[PDB]
A paper describes a structure:
EF-Tu brings aminoacylated transfer RNAs (aa-tRNAs) to the ribosome. The N-terminal domain (G domain) is a guanosine triphosphatase (GTPase) that is followed by two β-barrel domains, important for aa-tRNA binding. G-domain proteins generally function as molecular switches by alternating between inactive GDP-bound and active GTP-bound states. We provide structural and biophysical evidence that phosphorylation of EF-Tu at T382 acts as an efficient switch that turns off protein synthesis by decoupling nucleotide binding from the EF-Tu conformational cycle.
Residue numbers in the entry: 9 to 394
Amino acid sequence: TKPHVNVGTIGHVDHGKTTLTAAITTVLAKTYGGAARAFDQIDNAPEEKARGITINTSHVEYDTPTRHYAHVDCPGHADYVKNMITGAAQMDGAILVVAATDGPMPQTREHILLGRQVGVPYIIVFLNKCDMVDDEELLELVEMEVRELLSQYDFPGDDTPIVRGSALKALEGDAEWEAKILELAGFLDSYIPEPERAIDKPFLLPIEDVFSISGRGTVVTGRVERGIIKVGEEVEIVGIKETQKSTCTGVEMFRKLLDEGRAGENVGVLLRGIKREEIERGQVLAKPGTIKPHTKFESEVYILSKDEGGRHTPFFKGYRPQFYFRTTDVTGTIELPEGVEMVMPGDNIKMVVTLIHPIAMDDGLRFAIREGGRTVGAGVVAKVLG
Ligand SMILES: Nc1nc2c(ncn2[C@@H]2O[C@H](COP(=O)(O)OP(=O)(O)O)[C@@H](O)[C@H]2O)c(=O)[nH]1
Ligand SMILES: [Mg+2]
């Protein structure tokens, strides 16, 4: 099967993301095979529901000779904010569209900054509307502006592929400009490395339940998030309390006794030496020395709007909600950015959080913000602090 890669268009409004998305599907369909999509179908994005969050998202698919791509395009900036923090698939790379007529605009900066925060790993640039620009001096100056902006947020601007093109003329059928769509698709193939598959990451299992099995000791159940756990291998129980070491003495799937549990499977793991009461809501099983527990972190959060089922009134710096990490709520206190004293429903802000219990975490881990039982926001860990 062809490798699967998740991409999407980002960049400022009216710079040509949707026209480019249509052009890519159209050009690749007539060149390497597939199904073309038209501008109107993609611009008219369905409402996708992620929890209570409403995100207008168009999903499109296209193939290169060697890869299958799932591409995400959204109508408005508000959708890109929501999608980057809580969208169905995390982008493996992004196509930043920049209109040569306008140059980098405020959401060009914001989407790069968000990409950095939510951990978007590769960004390719399509410099659009070049059918309007005859001057090569201008095009060079815009290209340098985009490279500086990428580097400002630690992307490798100097080595970043930038394709000078015209999404519109390519969608209209002009073969000269279509070649630029193939150049861009070439860069998707060559510049975005194939992402790391979960089965190859160090073992991780969020604990959902614990039982004292008769004559066999303590078992913890959960979905293997990544890696492989084998009978005989050592594990760490990470989070809430001081970290404990243990050994796997059995892997059970329903009534079937296994020798290993793999990423994606729902299993029960028998642990030597651990008593049922030594296990707490919110802990994970992990390969030893691969994930650490933290109480403090920086995050990018989106606060739900009233219509989405969230808060009706803003909160202030004393806000003390619950942060739901994998399996449980942990209370935290927050610090706001300087100048911000109030956070309105529907806002998104950088939030420094201090939980009252440690949670095993790494950059890019998603969480929900909750009040009482109900969800009021969504975040991504941008930087762990300790
Ligand atoms: N002249 C020219 N116009 C373009 C090009 N790409 C897009 N446009 C026009 O710019 C407008 C906005 O494009 P659109 O894809 O909807 O922008 P989006 O908000 O980023 O999705 C539309 O009128 C497009 O047809 C291009 O390469 N050349
Ligand atoms: Mg659009």
